[PDB]
Symmetry: C3
Subunit: 169 residues, 3 copies
């Protein structure tokens, strides 16, 4: 079959988008407005549920814009088949806590947020607005064979017990 | 074929598990007991060898629990076909070194470890116990065609030389 | 078809390599010489363009050597089909800014760079040389079905609305 089922869990949820046939995955939006201070960790709720069929895995991963411009680090989530719960974005503000203060929050593009009401924030703080495009979902097929414990392998390769950790060549 | 070969390299090794037909990959366990101080890097040995056939790649990656609860960051390892050596978990404790001390170690769930014997640790330190479930392996098929150097591409797309780095839209 | 088209954008560009039939992906080289101070972010240009066909995605990802030896963190780039622009390596030097000074730069293998001309650098600084092998590209097939909004899913699974965030079991 060529259909994926999507359940919206609230009015704050936004439907994933795949504009262009050339695009790899689906744009994921935040359903929460959240301020992340330097070094702070959170799981941002999308209020979106997905039904991935067997033989596939979803990759809830970062986008080039947010990750390259800001210190907001998204850990790629392995969305298993059958998981019909709320998709959470595993995020960390990886800006260092330098103990310095500023009156400007930063957006998901590293642009300064101008406010009428003046407030003091810790330098390196970000704000993710409700409805903002911060992640993407890329679904790839998986191979899940039966495991067999062996003492030696059937086919000896030309790479072998090497080579973990090779820099400089 | 629908079989994957697994070699245990020591008695400390633990067999990877795929409970449920709905699960994406295989649970990987640590074979070492290791204390990671803030900002410390290590390669944790599993004492497990795997024989991935050609046309596939293994993804030695994080789990939602450990990564969301703790500052333990696992870099996804690309397990090549033919690599029959020890699978190492590329890990870093990404807690900041604030120079502060505590008498509590943190486990892989960010819970405080209570000890009868009192010791002073640096705040943000974690302990990975031998046998603990800290990673997972997801095997996906790969496309490895022959490369052809061109001056211009055959099919001009509608995405084009764009678009790297787009935030805010 | 079993062919991938590659365009070199400058003389500084280097052709991706896939030595051995056992290897997962293609070795990517830097086209820039760049010094990254602690906590600094950059997008390193490869001056290499690729034409990935539809039904596939490229994974511009780290290698075991650089990532395990150094604090240089590469965020895996999702190279979409049709993207014919310059492939950029999304990188961050994740060494902490301890305010300390040294006369040695570190290479991509964490080895000290010896210089005839003496200079003062911030401790934790790295230098990526033009032509150095720092990344790899692994191409995997993608599933991109049509989306259908539902109120409830057709097939209820045995995993269910669980289980996000499970450590310690
Ligand atoms: O960033 C993430 C990671 C995981 N999950 C969901 C999907 C998985 O099916 C489930 C369990 O994750 P693991 O513990 O298997 O990583 O949690 C998310 O929603 N977001
Ligand atoms: O986290 C990792 C990364 C790599 N490898 C193994 C599998 C690869 O076949 C080999 C070489 O890795 P690269 O240098 O190709 O990344 O090291 C691991 O065991 N764990
Ligand atoms: O590290 C990266 C990430 C992305 N891209 C390119 C490929 C994508 O087609 C395009 C858009 O990226 P996203 O915004 O979709 O992540 O930028 C890179 O060259 N390097
Ligand atoms: Ni990944
Ligand atoms: Ni950090």
């Amino acid at each position: 079959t060529n259909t994926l089922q999507v359940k919206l869990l609230s009015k704050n949820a936004r439907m994933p988008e795949r504009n262009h046939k050339t695009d790899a995955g689906y744009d994921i939006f935040s359903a929460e407005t959240v301020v992340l201070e330097p070094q702070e960790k959170a799981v941002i709720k999308t209020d979106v549920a997905v039904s991935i069929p067997e033989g596939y895995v979803g990759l809830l991963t970062s986008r080039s814009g947010v990750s390259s411009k800001t210190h907001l680090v998204i850990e790629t989530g392995k969305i298993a088949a059958g998981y019909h719960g709320n998709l959470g974005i595993n995020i960390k503000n990886d800006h260092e806590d330098d103990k310095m203060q500023t009156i400007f929050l930063r957006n998901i593009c590293n642009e300064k947020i101008f406010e009428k009401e003046r407030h003091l924030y810790k330098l390196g703080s970000y704000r993710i607005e409700k409805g903002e495009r911060i992640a993407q979902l890329v679904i790839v097929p998986i191979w899940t064979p039966e495991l067999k414990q062996v003492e030696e392998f059937e086919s000896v390769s030309e790479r072998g017990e090497k080579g973990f950790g090779s820099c400089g060549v």
